[PDB]
Amino acid sequence: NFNFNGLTGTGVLTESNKKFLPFQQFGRDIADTTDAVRDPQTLEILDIT
Amino acid sequence: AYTNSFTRGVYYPDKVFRSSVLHSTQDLFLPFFSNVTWFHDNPVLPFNDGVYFASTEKSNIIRGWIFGTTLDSKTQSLLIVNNATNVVIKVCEFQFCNYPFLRVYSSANNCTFEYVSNLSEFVFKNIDGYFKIYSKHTPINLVRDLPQGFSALEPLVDLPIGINITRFQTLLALAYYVGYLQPRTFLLKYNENGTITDAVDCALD
Ligand SMILES: *[C@@H]1O[C@H](CO)[C@@H](O[C@@H]2O[C@H](CO)[C@@H](O)[C@H](O)[C@H]2NC(C)=O)[C@H](O)[C@H]1NC(C)=O
Numbered sequence: 001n002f003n004f005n006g007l008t009g010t011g012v013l014t015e016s017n018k019k020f021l022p023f024q025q026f027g028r029d030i031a032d033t034t035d036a037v038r039d040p041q042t043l044e045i046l047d048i049t
Numbered sequence: 050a051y052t053n054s055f056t057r058g059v060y061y062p063d064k065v066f067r068s069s070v071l072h073s074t075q076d077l078f079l080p081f082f083s084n085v086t087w088f089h090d091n092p093v094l095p096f097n098d099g100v101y102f103a104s105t106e107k108s109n110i111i112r113g114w115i116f117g118t119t120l121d122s123k124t125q126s127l128l129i130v131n132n133a134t135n136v137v138i139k140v141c142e143f144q145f146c147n148y149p150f151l152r153v154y155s156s157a158n159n160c161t162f163e164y165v166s167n168l169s170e171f172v173f174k175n176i177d178g179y180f181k182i183y184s185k186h187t188p189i190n191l192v193r194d195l196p197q198g199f200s201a202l203e204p205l206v207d208l209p210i211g212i213n214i215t216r217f218q219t220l221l222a223l224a225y226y227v228g229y230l231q232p233r234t235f236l237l238k239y240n241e242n243g244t245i246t247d248a249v250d251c252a253l254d
């Protein structure tokens with residue numbers, strides 16, 4: 001389970017290769033589930049499959 | 050003088066990464082094939098619903114922009130200015146000079162900010178008091194008209210300034226283009242690396 005600045009769900013957090021631009025904080029699925037998230041402290045990108 | 054916008058002026062609408070997806074977005078954009086102004090002593094221009102601004106010259110003859118209702122210190126105004134050491138933005142009540150150049154103002158009465166840090170493309174939005182600047186720099190082989198092909202502006206800074214803006218002006222020193230946004234539905238081709246690579250202005254034709 002996770003909370004990321006309020007983004008809340010259940011997932012297998014994986015080190016993302018998705019190339020977020022420095023302003024972007026979330027990435028989204030066609031359903032508007034959140035597909036990847038920037039860590040709010042290490043600023044790395046994580047997949048949320 | 051007037052010219053073609055040639056599909057220049059698209060920017061990333063949301064701070065969400067999307068990739069290999071065509072996404073419909075409703076926002077203020079420069080409409081496609083818009084009829085933009087080109088300026089070849091110094092105009093004051095309306096801000097409209099929002100501004101697209103660009104200039105082709107690397108020699109830093111342009112130095113900034115000022116925005117407000119009055120541009121005369123009877124209210125606040127935004128000043129965006131660039132100097133030999135810093136990017137600078139502030140929201141002070143400047144007594145601006147009738148030609149503002151680097152000497153941009155005689156005096157100032159209050160302030161609430163001091164942010165700091167060859168075609169140059171800019172978009173300015175003001176919604177919910179957030180004055181949002183997007184830009185990109187793009188190569189060109191001609192000066193008198195905007196270049197062919199697609200170009201997405203990345204967000205540069207996003208400031209909660211909250212002042213009323215209706216007129217603006219560009220700072221020189223001792224050519225540029227202006228267009229204005231309108232509410233459009235756009236379809237954005239986000240590629241595999243999540244960059245917008247093409248778009249459709251759905252209300253065009
Ligand atoms: C933003 O500024 C404009 C002026 O640039 C304001 O327009 C004036 O509003 C008053 C009433 O408050 C009218 O009496 C004037 O005739 C208006 N002037 C013009 C040129 O239209 C506008 O009200 C301001 N808006 C906000 C939300 O502050």
Ligand SMILES: *[C@@H]1O[C@H](CO)[C@@H](O[C@@H]2O[C@H](CO)[C@@H](O)[C@H](O)[C@H]2NC(C)=O)[C@H](O)[C@H]1NC(C)=O
Nearest residue numbers: 130131132133134135136137138139163164165
């Ligand atoms: C560019 O503008 C900034 C102000 O936004 C200037 O920065 C100040 O410089 C003085 C020294 O001259 C410092 O004491 C201040 O602390 C600086 N302020 C900030 C906010 O950094 C800068 O000097 C200007 N550069 C030029 C070449 O004019």
Ligand SMILES: *[C@@H]1O[C@H](CO)[C@@H](O[C@@H]2O[C@H](CO)[C@@H](O)[C@H](O)[C@H]2NC(C)=O)[C@H](O)[C@H]1NC(C)=O
Nearest residue numbers: 122123124125141142143156157158159160161
């Ligand atoms: C900074 O701006 C405020 C307004 O936002 C000024 O406040 C006004 O001051 C005059 C006297 O100069 C008063 O008659 C008004 O009633 C004040 N307005 C409000 C809303 O309180 C303030 O004076 C400005 N600062 C300076 C140094 O001029």
Ligand SMILES: *[C@@H]1O[C@H](CO)[C@@H](O[C@@H]2O[C@H](CO)[C@@H](O)[C@H](O)[C@H]2NC(C)=O)[C@H](O)[C@H]1NC(C)=O
Nearest residue numbers: 017018019068069239240241242243244245246
């Ligand atoms: C998405 O990004 C990759 C890099 O991560 C791009 O591939 C590189 O492109 C440059 C030229 O612009 C080459 O020098 C690299 O060797 C390429 N790397 C690989 C691994 O092929 C790719 O072109 C981008 N995709 C799109 C559609 O622009």
Ligand SMILES: *[C@@H]1O[C@H](CO)[C@@H](O)[C@H](O)[C@H]1NC(C)=O
Nearest residue numbers: 038039040041042043044045
């Ligand atoms: C926040 O924490 C990280 C370590 O997780 C640290 O590197 C960083 O400096 C901290 N933020 C600030 C503003 O110091």
Ligand SMILES: *[C@@H]1O[C@H](CO)[C@@H](O)[C@H](O)[C@H]1NC(C)=O
Nearest residue numbers: 050051052053083084085086
């Ligand atoms: C561009 O707009 C101006 C008025 O805004 C008009 O005079 C001019 O003819 C227009 N040009 C084209 C090609 O439509």
